[PDB]
Design a protein around this ligand. Structure first.
Ligand SMILES: Nc1ncnc2c1ncn2[C@@H]1O[C@H](COP(=O)(O)OP(=O)(O)NP(=O)(O)O)[C@@H](O)[C@H]1O
Lengths: 350, 15
């Protein structure tokens, strides 16, 4: 009797889902593994309790809307969603997904990867991203901890709470001052708050992830965005005025152009034992100027990935996504209503 | 983390 508890808090997913086991937490959800008694298989279930904060509601609605509409081998699916039968009773949302074994953050924390693993993982990240971007969506928060792996080295991108249609404009305010667990994978233009950034921000993130697979260390850590820029410039060298084309804040632009000159550090000096083709691709992803970054299609065609490259089996969305309304200018009560309606179809009865 | 040989995608590319 009673609903199961995990590390101290209720997990009300029975009777369909039973035998809960803790997996971990992010900044926003707690994730457990569970036995699905309908499909007779173990699954993952992320609990979120977002309805007291506008931004939590935002993350929840975005991830639900986008993932329910994506279908790709290298992107996590949503199998089911549990929440109370009435909007008033609804305080928590349970997102059920395919169960994965680990993520790239934990793996890299202690485990060495061969050049072949690195190559295969990078390929899968990019195959996933090709689909995301083809749907005219930006992930915006790619990092090792939301690259899931199973035991057969299958990789799946998750954690779409910050994903947005690449509405080539749109002003997403608050995004930069909002809490996240790590900012180490963010492109320099987004850290500097340049409205009008593009798909290239994701490519930058992937570049940071590749660097980390090569060395088991983050390439641009830092206590904050200014310190992070100091790491970035220390390796890529000083930017030109043309590089700062996408840096729109006046003082930030002048600050950057005022700094002491920095020479580029060759990639093979930092990564002395890496495949030289990996370093060439890395060099093309981690370019300061967003418009000169290699895009995802050309990246998949890079000589480093030629052994897995196959455009006959790298599927895209049949049509670009177009978000229903605008979620950033909605009260949390409305966002809750939209979440209720978006999850209605999984209710026992519907 | 086996040889990627057991991964289905890598297996599809092994053709
Ligand atoms: N389907 C899954 N299978 C196995 N592990 C998962 C799964 N989904 C999430 N996890 C793990 O739980 C952690 C957090 O999930 P995540 O989706 O990032 O939740 P979050 O707090 O909403 N987002 P974030 O704060 O950016 O990490 C991940 O880093 C994974 O380690």
């Amino acid at each position: 009797a009673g609903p199961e508890m995990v590390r101290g808090q209720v997990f009300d997913v029975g009777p369909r889902y039973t035998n809960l086991s803790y997996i971990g937490e992010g900044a926003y959800g707690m994730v457990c593994s569970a036995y699905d008694n309908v499909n007779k298989v173990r699954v993952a279930i992320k609990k979120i309790s977002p309805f007291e904060h506008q931004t939590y509601c935002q993350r929840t609605l975005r991830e639900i809307k986008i993932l329910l509409r994506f279908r790709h081998e290298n992107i996590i699916g949503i199998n089911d969603i549990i929440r109370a039968p009435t909007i008033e009773q609804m305080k928590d949302v349970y997102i059920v997904q395919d169960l994965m074994e680990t993520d790239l953050y934990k793996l890299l924390k202690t485990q060495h990867l061969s050049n072949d693993h690195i190559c295969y993982f990078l390929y899968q990240i990019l195959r996933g991203l090709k689909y995301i971007h083809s749907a005219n969506v930006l992930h915006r928060d790619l990092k090792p901890s939301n690259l899931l792996l199973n035991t057969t080295c299958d990789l799946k991108i998750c954690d779409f709470g910050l994903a947005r249609v690449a509405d080539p404009d749109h002003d997403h305010t608050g995004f930069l001052t909002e809490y996240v667990a790590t900012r180490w994978y963010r492109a320099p233009e987004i850290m500097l708050n340049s409205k009008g950034y593009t798909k290239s921000i994701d490519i930058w993130s992937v570049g940071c992830i590749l660097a980390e697979m090569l060395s088991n260390r983050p390439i641009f850590p830092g206590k904050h965005y200014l310190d992070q820029l100091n790491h970035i410039l220390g390796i890529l060298g000083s930017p030109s005025q043309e590089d700062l084309n996408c840096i729109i804040n006046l003082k930030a632009r002048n600050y950057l152009l005022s700094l002491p000159h920095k020479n580029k550090v060759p990639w093979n000096r930092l990564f002395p034992n890496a495949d030289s083709k990996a370093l060439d691709l890395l060099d093309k992803m981690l370019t300061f100027n967003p418009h000169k970054r290699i895009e995802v299609e050309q990246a998949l065609a890079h000589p480093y990935l030629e052994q897995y490259y196959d455009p006959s089996d790298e599927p895209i969305a049949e049509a670009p996504f177009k978000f229903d309304m605008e979620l950033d200018d909605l009260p949390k009560e409305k966002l809750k209503e939209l979440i209720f309606e978006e999850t209605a179809r999984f209710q026992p009865g519907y | 983390l086996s040889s990627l040989a057991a991964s289905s995608l890598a297996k599809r590319r092994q053709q």
